[model samples]
Target: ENIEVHMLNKGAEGAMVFEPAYIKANPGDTVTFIPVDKGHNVESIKDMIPEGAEKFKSKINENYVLTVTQPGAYLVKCTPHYAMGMIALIAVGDSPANLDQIVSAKKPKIVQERLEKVIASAK
Candidate 1:
């Protein structure tokens, strides 16, 4: 089955956020990011993807559909609100193969706490 994560505004207690910040899916499943608010685009975090998975970035207000192709954790963030901690996590399949690497990757300090929370929620 597919999954949907809403891109919201002033969510998470007034911070830009993704509703249901964390999700679990199987490889081959699709995840769609719906823009409930404008000016948000989905972008895959480079250092947080699996080896064979392709990275993507969508244009503003465009709904983005990502087909999970590998077993690992994928990190997605809103380009315009990334620093505001507008991020989401998708755990594909059961592996979470890049979990450790993702946790260790360098990220902007502004989103560090949210990113950590997203990763931990996947466990």
Candidate 2:
């Protein structure tokens, strides 16, 4: 399925969240980031991508999609709003093979917390 991941001004859980902070996808799924609140962009976090998985990013105020073909996890964040918790974790299969790496990577306090929450849900 083609997925619309919304970027919001304020989130139900916190400020500036990428709605569906955690998502599950399959090899054919495509992720589309909607800059719903303006100026929100998407970037894949370092050390979180599946080995050999292509990294994705979007220019501010534009739109883009990431193809999911690896069975691992990916961390996506908005450069400007990362500290505000505009982040998401995506698993490309029923179980992510790289779940451990996400928690080990150093990140902003709030960013890590947001990732942790979603990782918890994924587990």
Candidate 3:
């Protein structure tokens, strides 16, 4: 199945975020990054993705998509607005094994909490 994550200018929770910031997915599931607002974009952190998965940085205004292969969690950010709290977690399969590593990395409180919630709900 394909899970759609919206890049929002201002979401119900707050500003400059991904709607449904915590995404749950399965192996081979395609994750769609929709630019609900122009300019916001998706870029995978170099060390945030599971091993063997190619790093991805979508063109600034593209509706990019990726299918999950490696099982774990991924921390994706809207590089243009990362400091503005535009980061989200993609949970692949069920373990969310790498989220601990993701959280230990420097992140805004907003992002760290989102990562925590995903792992919480996952368990």
Off by over 4 Å in 2: 121-123
Candidate 1 per-residue C-alpha lDDT over 1-81 given as tens digits, one digit per residue, 9 for 90 to 100: 788888888776347888778888997798888999998998998778888889899999988888888888888889999
- TM-score of predicted structure 2: 0.91
Clashing pairs in 2: none
TM-score of each: 0.90, 0.91, 0.88
Q: Which 10-residue window in model 3 sums to the lowest lDDT?
A: 114-123
Question: lDDT winner among the candidates?
Answer: 2
Candidate order, TM-score descending = 2, 1, 3
**Which candidate leads the pack in TM-score?**
2
lDDT of 2: 0.84
Query: What's the TM for model 3?
Result: 0.88
Q: List runs of model 3 lying over 4 Å from the truth.
A: 117-123
Residue 23 in candidate 3, Cα distance off native in Å: 0.9
Candidate 1 wrong stretches, greater than 4 Å: 121-123
Instruction: lDDT winner between 2 and 3, please give it.
Output: 2
| Better by TM-score, candidate 3 or 1 | 1
Report the lDDT tens digits of candidate 3 across residue range 1-123.
998888888986578888778888888899899998898888998799998788988888799998888888888999898877788888788767787788898877876765676557533
Measured over all alpha carbons after superposition, the RMSD of each candidate to the real structure, in angstroms, is 1.6, 1.5, 2.0
